[PDB]
Amino acid sequence: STGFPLELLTRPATERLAYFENYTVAHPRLKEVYEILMRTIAEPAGASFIFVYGASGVGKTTLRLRVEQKLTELALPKLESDRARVPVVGIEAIAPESRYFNWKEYYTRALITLEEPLIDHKFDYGVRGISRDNFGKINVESKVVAPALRRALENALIHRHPDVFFVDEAQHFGKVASGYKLQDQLDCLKSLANMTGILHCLLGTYELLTFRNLSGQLSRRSVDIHFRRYCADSPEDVQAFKSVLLTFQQHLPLAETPNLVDHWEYFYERTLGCIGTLKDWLKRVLSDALDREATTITLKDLQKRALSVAQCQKMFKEIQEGERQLSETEADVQNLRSALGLG
Amino acid sequence: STGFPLELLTRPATERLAYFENYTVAHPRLKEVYEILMRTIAEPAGASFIFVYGASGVGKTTLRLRVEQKLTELALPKLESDRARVPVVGIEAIAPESRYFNWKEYYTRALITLEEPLIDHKFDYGVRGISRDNFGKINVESKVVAPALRRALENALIHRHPDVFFVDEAQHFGKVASGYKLQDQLDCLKSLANMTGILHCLLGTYELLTFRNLSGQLSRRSVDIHFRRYCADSPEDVQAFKSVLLTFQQHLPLAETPNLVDHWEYFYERTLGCIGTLKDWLKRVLSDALDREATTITLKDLQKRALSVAQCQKMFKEIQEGERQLSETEADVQNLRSALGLG
Amino acid sequence: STGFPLELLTRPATERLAYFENYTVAHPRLKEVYEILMRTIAEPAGASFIFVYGASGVGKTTLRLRVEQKLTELALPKLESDRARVPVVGIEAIAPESRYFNWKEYYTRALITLEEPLIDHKFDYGVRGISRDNFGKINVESKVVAPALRRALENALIHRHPDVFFVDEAQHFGKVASGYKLQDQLDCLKSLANMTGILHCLLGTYELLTFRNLSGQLSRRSVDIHFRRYCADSPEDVQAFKSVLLTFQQHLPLAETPNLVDHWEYFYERTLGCIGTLKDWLKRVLSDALDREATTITLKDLQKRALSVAQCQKMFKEIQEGERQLSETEADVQNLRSALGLG
Amino acid sequence: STGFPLELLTRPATERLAYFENYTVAHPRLKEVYEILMRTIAEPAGASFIFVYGASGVGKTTLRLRVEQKLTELALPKLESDRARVPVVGIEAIAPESRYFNWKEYYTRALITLEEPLIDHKFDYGVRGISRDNFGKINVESKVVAPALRRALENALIHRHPDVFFVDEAQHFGKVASGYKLQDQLDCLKSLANMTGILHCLLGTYELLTFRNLSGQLSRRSVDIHFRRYCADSPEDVQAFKSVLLTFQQHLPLAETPNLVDHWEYFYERTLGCIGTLKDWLKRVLSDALDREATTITLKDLQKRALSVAQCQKMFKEIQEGERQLSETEADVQNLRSALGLG
Amino acid sequence: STGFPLELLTRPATERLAYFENYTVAHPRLKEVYEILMRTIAEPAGASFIFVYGASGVGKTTLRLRVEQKLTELALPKLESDRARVPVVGIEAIAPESRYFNWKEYYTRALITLEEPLIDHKFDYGVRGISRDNFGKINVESKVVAPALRRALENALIHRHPDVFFVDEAQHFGKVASGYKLQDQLDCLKSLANMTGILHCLLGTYELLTFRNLSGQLSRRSVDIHFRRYCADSPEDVQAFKSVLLTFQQHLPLAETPNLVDHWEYFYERTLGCIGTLKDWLKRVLSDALDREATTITLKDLQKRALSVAQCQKMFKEIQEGERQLSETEADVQNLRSALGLG
DNA sequence: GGCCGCTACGTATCGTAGATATATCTACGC
DNA sequence: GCGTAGATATATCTACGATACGTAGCGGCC
Ligand SMILES: Nc1ncnc2c1ncn2[C@@H]1O[C@H](COP(=O)(O)OP(=O)(O)OP(=O)(O)O)[C@@H](O)[C@H]1O
Ligand SMILES: Nc1ncnc2c1ncn2[C@@H]1O[C@H](COP(=O)(O)OP(=O)(O)OP(=O)(O)O)[C@@H](O)[C@H]1O
Ligand SMILES: Nc1ncnc2c1ncn2[C@@H]1O[C@H](COP(=O)(O)OP(=O)(O)OP(=O)(O)O)[C@@H](O)[C@H]1O
Ligand SMILES: Nc1ncnc2c1ncn2[C@@H]1O[C@H](COP(=O)(O)OP(=O)(O)OP(=O)(O)O)[C@@H](O)[C@H]1O
Ligand SMILES: Nc1ncnc2c1ncn2[C@@H]1O[C@H](COP(=O)(O)OP(=O)(O)OP(=O)(O)O)[C@@H](O)[C@H]1O
Ligand SMILES: [Mg+2]
Ligand SMILES: [Mg+2]
Ligand SMILES: [Mg+2]
Ligand SMILES: [Mg+2]
Ligand SMILES: [Mg+2]
């Protein structure tokens, strides 16, 4: 069958909810972005940053998880022979309790996340304030200053040598007090990547575009991947969105499969084409239906757990500005050639 | 009988006042908002915020308490088997005697309230400046920097994993020094809610609307629940107001039940439809009557403890703007569809 | 006799002056406002603020003292059975040297005043900086940060459970530099009151009309009590003024009682209703007479130590303004009817 | 053959990728810059700085590696006879987390990098906080103040006496707080160089022109080497770029040698004449074409890993203004003569 | 002969380069300044500061070295009889990493530099924190507060009694943040000179003029020696420069003596008449010629190792700026006579 | 005359060294 | 024979200085 297993109807609601939660769909944009990211990670070729832009609800975190899993699987056969190697390390950036992104916490959290291997790996981190304990947890005291933590993290990264160092919610790097400090933050990250040779991938919303082009050096060593949404203007994206809706409705564990392609306009209006928004909206509707033990879904039910027009209107304002800034037109190439004198 | 028990008359005045205080009425808006909130808490589906708005004397705190008690009673069977579980952690915000919102105090208050289980549960939380004592209290020294407290709170929340984290009178988060810092405050809370995977519910008045829609990501990860007041224009709200007035009249521990529905216009004038304000009014009047040991109530007694016109006028000014902001019309849908191209 | 005992004549002038000073006459406004406040603080019913409004001489301080003494008397039988309870505590706001009202000093003075019971009650207050001493005083180290003092004061307030917290001269809270600071001062007070569940009565002059109505929450959770002065328009007010004046005349410890009711116009001119102004004016005149032992009082004696016109009109400007804002007319009532739709 | 070894086609993908990566092409600009740098390092003649300006892709780091290798080779036969001497020490500047550059970390890391000889070499540097360990690595305590580290580093430099002291990514020196502090930073570097008599070479992007001629004293002891890119206005640079493209396509390990000189305009458009960027582009394209096992490179393949137009547009912006500062014209000579009176 | 020794042509390049670098030419300005400095050093007569101003290239360091060597040779006969007497002690000024000149480092460096005789002198300095070691190099337990180290330096200076204390690049004293702190620095140096009674000679660039006559006390107690460069308006210095060029071309270890007299304008343009800069230029050109084994110096060779016009323009920009400050005219005499009334 | 932007200053905070409490080894006086 | 004294190293507390941020008062513009 092309849908959910029919056996799940007999099971209680918890397994149905879980099955729908763990189910993931493949859509053209996700596949394309995944391929590009994997190709970039495999041969960075002197690139230290991968800025993965995308709206909220597009699949950035799911993409990161998929890439992480595939990298781990790929590195497993070699990990059998060679040890002290982590295939990929991922951390999520923290919004600071202030207007400035503290770096000490970032360093210590990176050290914690990177260093949770089998205890057999001993590498005697530099600086004396960082050590192991009785429970295998990294001990970092307030004794150590930020440069010391940075040195320890650099040595650890060089020793472990992960393929890529994922940083999720990278927009939080933009919490600075000074405008030039915005470039300075990325310069610090660039130096960290340069002196360890570990590829850094930044995943964030369209407010990460403040980091897009700043200093030529950073522009040279950054790869821009755009996780674009499904627009309504292009008929192909509409067809793709409808296919996603069709497979979602096929995969909804209900006694009766509802008709979702019919109200595709409503889904687009309340999701803006983001597959994640559609997925979690359908998750809410399905949870409600399972709680009510209702064989199927109604538009009303969709209207209950939809997103407010005000919510979506703010979404499209940011998405509109994000895509406008990331727009490459043939006219732009003309100025570049004209400026370069190649006209 | 559908009213107060008759045997209370023989018992003294204090227990009568206590009975009226402990008495709670059920009205359509309360039950609707309660069911919506319970459904949202049962599954967030990638949401980290619930912004429950509403006027004053509307039952937000009572709704919170009801939700907490319901969730606790739901979780008790599983608590009997699995230890180290707190179903709901509910906290109220603190208005800084100054300007900025003290995050350190928020974190330490969270640690204090969250960790009051049976002493058997020990988790030697990260950072060495937080520990138990000889009375079971949590000791937080001033030496512990705010990010350390954040890490400790994150660990505790991750282990205990409450279903929902209530932040009452959340409008106190607006006490900030920088205008843009509103979004920063909300981002800090979002980041705290991301890595812990704990649903944050922000209980607040209409002043909380300043946080209502800032950035797309916060829009995606928030649901807006509106505790609307019983308006006067819609006849059904008038019927509900009269019904709750009659219900209150029936459960007034007096020798003679006063006729209360007749003067409903006065009650609406002073309570603006908020059930809480009406309950306060009737509590004051009952206390006065029981002090005078009078058989029944009169409009006079009502006017003594009535809210004055001036203070009541300010409330409606706040309510009028709040409801206007939170009003979604069919027209607003049209611009959203027009902008997207779904016309 | 209804007047001073005749035995005071033999006693020296100091004793007579003391007898007249500690004497406190009762007037209809005094008893009315006293009963209203008693009934308001007998149960607050979700009101956290009491705003006793009154000009110079209404008798706010003496009303506070009367209320404290009454409740202290009322609580003796329970105190004999239950320890660790203070019936009522109260302080006076400090006008800060600097621009901003100092919350640290307020908190520390509140802690000092509240915590002076018999030394048996030990409650091991939070914060290491707070404890007892060799002399039984509470020592507060300057190293203690403000939020820590607030938490300690909160715990003390919760444990001691006072019936009402008096803040005399509350107009001193208005010393702020930001327009919104005016409000979040009162918000901090409200948060302190809510978190402790202790009614906070604010006795202050007509300058407190600044704090009258700010936001719906503080508009709802506050009840306004107006200590109106005896005006001249109302014949009942004039009769009460003359009765109080006659009682004052009868209660002068003088060899021969002078006729005081004749110059009622002069007295009202120089006191404009404030009973306290009349009382301390008469204290002044009686002391002056006793210095010379003059068997009586004359018009020039009153004129010698009256209130000058320059100041006297100044109170009128303030008083008529406050009475203007505190005036609720039928026009305002019908304005609420129209706006709310109950016309 | 003038092309790549034809045996590589039998080898797997990794070998071919490694061969292409390890290929270093010789082009006129690199040759001339290398010769000038060798000449200026052979004898400083009262110079302490070599400023090597180069855009992001000129081959600054590969030039540093080449000169390092050559210096080591030239020092080798006397190194067999003379010990306690390192030919060259190579370091890279660290972008600080804070606003200002951290000199303590610079000093300690300089000591770390310079001090990795065989364990036999014992000097016993000044200050008690610096020593060896059981693994032979220098351990630096956190308690050592910056001047002490500076003194120890000076002693180490005067003992080892390296020919040159490479500070890569020297752009990070410009992160300071005070405007004038640039001069102080460069003077600190000059002072470090002077006592040790060690020629420092600073490699950085066109941003490093902020340090160019900020002081006459610093202007005297600095040599400006410009690592110019290939222009398009000059036919000679165009022909050189064409020749280098021919050499690259000649040595690409593919079954069919692709034709690249046709779209020289395209290659210039996305590389601005930078050689490193072109090499990285071709490395990524080769990796892609070698994953699909394709016997050639297709245009669309170049379009896949080409830098964004926005990235290249800005790189020209900083290059164009950078070259403008570095432009020497006959007009400047005439103004010098007029100012000097030599006209 | 008036040229270089002829037998060096048979010798390898290294010997010729060494001969050229070790050869020192004598020119009128150097001789005049040298004799003035020697006369001043012979007797200070109440002057505690010898301010030697000169551009970067005038030959300040070589003049200092020659003066120190001459004083050492003069004091050899007395040193043979009298021990514990250093004739001349000279240290270098350290540019500080922070914005403040570190006086502690200056004091300890002065002590370590001055205290390097054979181990027989056991002076037993004041303060317990400073002592010898096995290797003879003293160690200063950082603990030692800076003023105690200063006092130890005072004792060392009065015991050893050097003739002059040389400080190179004394403009490094000017790195402060407070405007009036310049006077404080100079006052500290003057005090250190006073009780020690040791003439302090400061040599630095034209930016040393910031402490020229910053106060009357320092103005009187300091005499200034100007190390003027060679100008162009005056034919005398032009002829001197011509003679210097002729001597250098006669002393070049080459087979053919190049004609440097033709391009005297070019040499003056690219050296600004600084003998040191010209010497370094010729050193570079000679090294290149020896590398190419060319029996001559071709013009283009001079352009290869010349200085950028931007560098030279910055040279002359600061040279002319300081010269007008250091210009004394007869016009400045008349007002001084007029102001005193001496006119 | 009113409102907005700048900036000068207080102040919390954090780095930082170095005073010090103390543990441990060894010698010696009781 | 043994306990205690003396010396010393070491981390950790603590005092002090540097710094970035809030912020109110004051100058400028409509
Ligand atoms: N292709 C997909 N298939 C199924 N679920 C998906 C897919 N893409 C996203 N999701 C759902 O989206 C949620 C994960 O968040 P997602 O990565 O979509 O958010 P995002 O907006 O891109 O990033 P952020 O967390 O920064 O807002 C999960 O509920 C996940 O199931
Ligand atoms: N449905 C109800 N039935 C009975 N009493 C109610 C009800 N709703 C509110 N109350 C009364 O209101 C008081 C609790 O405050 P309430 O929850 O109304 O405040 P709120 O306005 O929603 O919140 P806030 O304090 O933020 O303004 C109690 O006295 C409670 O008895
Ligand atoms: N009813 C009264 N009988 C006798 N004396 C009175 C009475 N009311 C006030 N007083 C006198 O007034 C003085 C106390 O000041 P009072 O409380 O009247 O001032 P107020 O202006 O109302 O308030 P505040 O203390 O804020 O200025 C005392 O001397 C007291 O004796
Ligand atoms: N002549 C060359 N031959 C081969 N590879 C080269 C050459 N020049 C540069 N590269 C390549 O360039 C990369 C090294 O970086 P490169 O020195 O070009 O950077 P840069 O821009 O000068 O400096 P930065 O690292 O500061 O941006 C390597 O991938 C190297 O293979
Ligand atoms: N008269 C001279 N004869 C030979 N060499 C000289 C002469 N004057 C200066 N030099 C050369 O100049 C260099 C010494 O530096 P010099 O004192 O000239 O520099 P400065 O700019 O005056 O001072 P600084 O750089 O220390 O501020 C040496 O290479 C030395 O050989
Ligand atoms: Mg996501
Ligand atoms: Mg409430
Ligand atoms: Mg009073
Ligand atoms: Mg490079
Ligand atoms: Mg010199």
- The CA distance from C150 to C155, in Å, is 9
Angle of helix B235-250 relative to helix B264-271, nearest 10 degrees, comes to 100
- The CA distance from B305 to C29, in Å, is 18
Query: Which residues from chain C sit within 8 angstroms of residue B315, using beta carbons?
Result: 216, 219-220
Neighbours of C240 (CB within 10 A): 17
Chain G nucleotides close to protein (CB under 7 A) are 11-12, 18-25
Q: How far is the CA of C62 from the centre of ligand 3 (A)?
A: 6
Q: In Å, what is the CA distance from C157 to each residue of B196, C89, C123, C125, D317? A: 34, 10, 12, 11, 66
- The CA distance from D155 to D82, in Å, is 19
Q: In Å, what is the CA distance from A58 to each residue of A28, A242, B8? A: 12, 16, 62
Answer whether B94 sits within 8 Å of C43, measured CB to CB. Answer: no
**Cβ atoms of B66 and B227 closer than 8 Å:** no
**Cβ atoms of B172 and B93 closer than 8 Å:** yes
Query: Which residues from chain A sit within 8 angstroms of residue B332, using beta carbons?
Result: 309-310, 313
Q: Is D276 in the pocket of ligand 4 (CB under 6 A)?
A: yes
Q: Is E247 in the pocket of ligand 5 (CB under 6 A)?
A: no
The gap between A29 CA and F8 C1' (Å) is 54
Q: Is C24 in the pocket of ligand 3 (CB under 6 A)?
A: yes
* Nearest alpha-carbon partner for A153 in A192, A205, A206: A192
- The CA distance from B250 to B258, in Å, is 9
Q: How far is the CA of E59 from the centre of ligand 5 (A)?
A: 4
Query: Which residues from chain C sit within 8 angstroms of residue B93, using beta carbons?
Result: 191
- The CA distance from A2 to A200, in Å, is 38
Cβ pairs bridging A and B (under 8 Å) = 126
Where residue D298 falls (left for φ over 0; alpha for ψ -120 to 50; beta otherwise) is beta
User: Amino acid identity of B224?
Assistant: D
* Nearest alpha-carbon partner for B89 in B213, B198, B209: B198
Answer whether D175 sits within 8 Å of A187, measured CB to CB. Answer: yes
B222-227 vs B139-140, strand pairing mode: unpaired
Answer whether B333 sits within 8 Å of A57, measured CB to CB. Answer: no
Residue C226: closest C-alpha in chain B: B308
Across chain A, where does the E strand assignment appear? 49-54, 88-92, 130-131, 139-140, 164-168, 199-203, 222-227
* Nearest alpha-carbon partner for A284 in A267, A299, A304: A304
**Cβ atoms of E175 and E209 closer than 8 Å:** no
Chain D closest-CA separation from residue E90 CA (Å)? 13
* Nearest alpha-carbon partner for A271 in A59, A66, A62: A59
Query: Do chain D and E touch: 3 or more Cβ pairs under 8 angstroms?
Result: yes
> Kindly report the CA angle at D104 between D101 and D106, in degrees rounded to 5?
70
Cβ-Cβ contacts under 8 Å for A26 (sequence gap 6 or more): none
Chain A closest-CA separation from residue D280 CA (Å)? 5
Q: Which residue is nearest to nucleotide F18 (CA to C1')?
A: E143
Distance of CA C220 to the CA centre of its chain: 22
Closest CB to D308: pick one of A124, A216, A328: A328
Q: What is the maximum span of chain C, computed from C-alpha positions, in angstroms?
A: 71
**Cβ atoms of B187 and B221 closer than 8 Å:** no
Q: Which residues pair with B90 in a beta bridge?
A: B166
**Cβ atoms of C34 and C60 closer than 8 Å:** no
Q: Which residues pair with C225 in a beta bridge?
A: C52
Long-range contacts of B149-152 (CB under 8 A, 24+ apart): B149/B104, B149/B107, B149/B108, B149/B111, B150/A94, B150/A97, B150/B103, B150/B107, B150/B192, B151/A105, B151/A109, B151/B126, B151/B127, B152/B107, B152/B111, B152/B125, B152/B126, B152/B127
Please name the nucleotide lying closest to D142, CA to C1'.
F16
Neighbours of chain B (3+ CB pairs under 8 A): A, C
Q: Is the dihedral of CA C7, C11, C17, C22 positive or negative?
A: negative
Neighbours of A179 (CB within 10 A): 8
Cβ-Cβ contacts under 8 Å for B71 (sequence gap 6 or more): B41, B87, B88, B163, B164
Q: Which residue is nearest to nucleotide G20 (CA to C1')?
A: A177
- The CA distance from E214 to E171, in Å, is 14
Distance of CA E56 to the CA centre of its chain: 10
- The CA distance from A219 to E322, in Å, is 43
Chain E closest-CA separation from residue D45 CA (Å)? 5
The gap between C144 CA and F12 C1' (Å) is 14
* Nearest alpha-carbon partner for D52 in D62, D43, D42: D62
Q: In Å, what is the CA distance from D16 to each residue of B43, D10, D244, D277, D292? A: 53, 10, 20, 19, 14
Distance of CA B276 to the CA centre of its chain: 12
Neighbours of chain E (3+ CB pairs under 8 A): D
Specify the experimental method.
Answer: cryo-EM
If interface means Cβ-Cβ distance under 8 Å, which residues of chain B face chain A? 39, 42-43, 45-47, 103-104, 126, 128, 145-148, 150-151, 178, 181, 184, 187-188, 190-191, 194-195, 212-213, 215-217, 219-222, 224, 328, 332-333, 335-337, 339-342
Resolution of this deposited model, Å: 2.9
Query: Which residues from chain B sit within 8 angstroms of residue A307, using beta carbons?
Result: 219-220
Q: Binding site for Mg(2+): residue ranges of B?
A: 61, 168-169
* Nearest alpha-carbon partner for C107 in C213, C191, C220, C180: C191
Q: Binding site for Mg(2+): residue ranges of A?
A: 61, 168-169
- The CA distance from B295 to E77, in Å, is 125
Task: Read off the tokens for D97.
Answer: 């987390």
Answer whether E205 sits within 8 Å of D221, measured CB to CB. Answer: no
Query: Which residues from chain B sit within 8 angstroms of residue C341, using beta carbons?
Result: 232-233
DSSP H or E segment with residue C66: helix C60-74
Q: In Å, what is the CA distance from C127 to each residue of B119, B140, C191, D1? A: 21, 9, 20, 83
Dihedrals φ, ψ of B330, to 5°?
A: -65, -30
Atom 27 of ligand 5: nearest residue by CA position: E56
Q: What is the 3-state secondary structure (H, E, C) of chain E?
A: CCCCCHHHHCCCHHHHHHHHHHCCCCCHHHHHHHHHHHHHHHCCCCCCEEEEEECCCCCHHHHHHHHHHHHHHHHHHHHHHCCCCCCEEEEECCCCCCCCCCHHHHHHHHHHHHCCCCCCCCCCCCCCCEECCCCCCCEECCCCCHHHHHHHHHHHHHHHCCCEEEEECHHHHHCCCCCCHHHHHHHHHHHHHHHHCCEEEEEECHHHHHHCCCCHHHHHCEEEEEECCCCCCCHHHHHHHHHHHHHHHHCCCCCCCCCCCCCHHHHHHHHCCCHHHHHHHHHHHHHHHHHHCCCCCCHHHHHHCCCCHHHHHHHHHHHHHHHHHCCCCCHHHHHHHHHCCCC
- The CA distance from B170 to B175, in Å, is 11
Q: Which residues pair with B92 in a beta bridge?
A: B168
**Cβ atoms of D280 and A46 closer than 8 Å:** yes
| Residue of E97, E107, E321 for testing the chain D interface, max D β-carbons within 10 Å | E97
Residues with CB under 6 A from ligand 2: B 24-25, 27, 30, 54, 56-62, 169, 205, 275-276, 279-280; C 46, 217
- The CATH number for A48-220, chosen from 1.10.3470, 1.20.120, 3.40.50, 1.10.860, is 3.40.50
- The CA distance from C32 to C40, in Å, is 12
The gap between E315 CA and F7 C1' (Å) is 36
Q: In Å, what is the CA distance from B288 to each residue of B258, B300, C45? A: 14, 11, 12
Query: Do chain C and D touch: 3 or more Cβ pairs under 8 angstroms?
Result: no
Task: Read off the tokens for B314.
Answer: 């300010």
Atom 24 of ligand 5: nearest residue by CA position: E56
- The CA distance from E259 to E297, in Å, is 9
Domain ranges of chain E: 6-23+251-325, 28-227
| Residue of B56, B97, B282, B285 for testing the chain C interface, max C β-carbons within 10 Å | B97
- The CA distance from D230 to A98, in Å, is 46
Answer whether A339 sits within 8 Å of D319, measured CB to CB. Answer: no
Q: Is A170 in the pocket of ligand 1 (CB under 6 A)?
A: no
Chain D closest-CA separation from residue A341 CA (Å)? 7
Fold of B28-227: Rossmann fold (3.40.50)
Angle of helix D309-325 relative to helix A330-340, nearest 10 degrees, comes to 20
Footprint of strand G on the protein (CB under 7 A): A 98-100, 128, 143, 177-178; B 98-100, 177-178; C 99-100, 177-178, 181; D 98-100, 143, 177; E 98-100, 177
Q: Among C27, C279, C318, which is best to mutate for testing ligand 3, by the most ligand atoms less than 8 A from CB?
A: C279
User: Amino acid identity of A215?
Assistant: S
Answer whether D56 sits within 8 Å of A151, measured CB to CB. Answer: no
Task: Read off the tokens for B338.
Answer: 């027009």
Q: Is C244 in the pocket of ligand 3 (CB under 6 A)?
A: no
Chain B closest-CA separation from residue A13 CA (Å)? 13
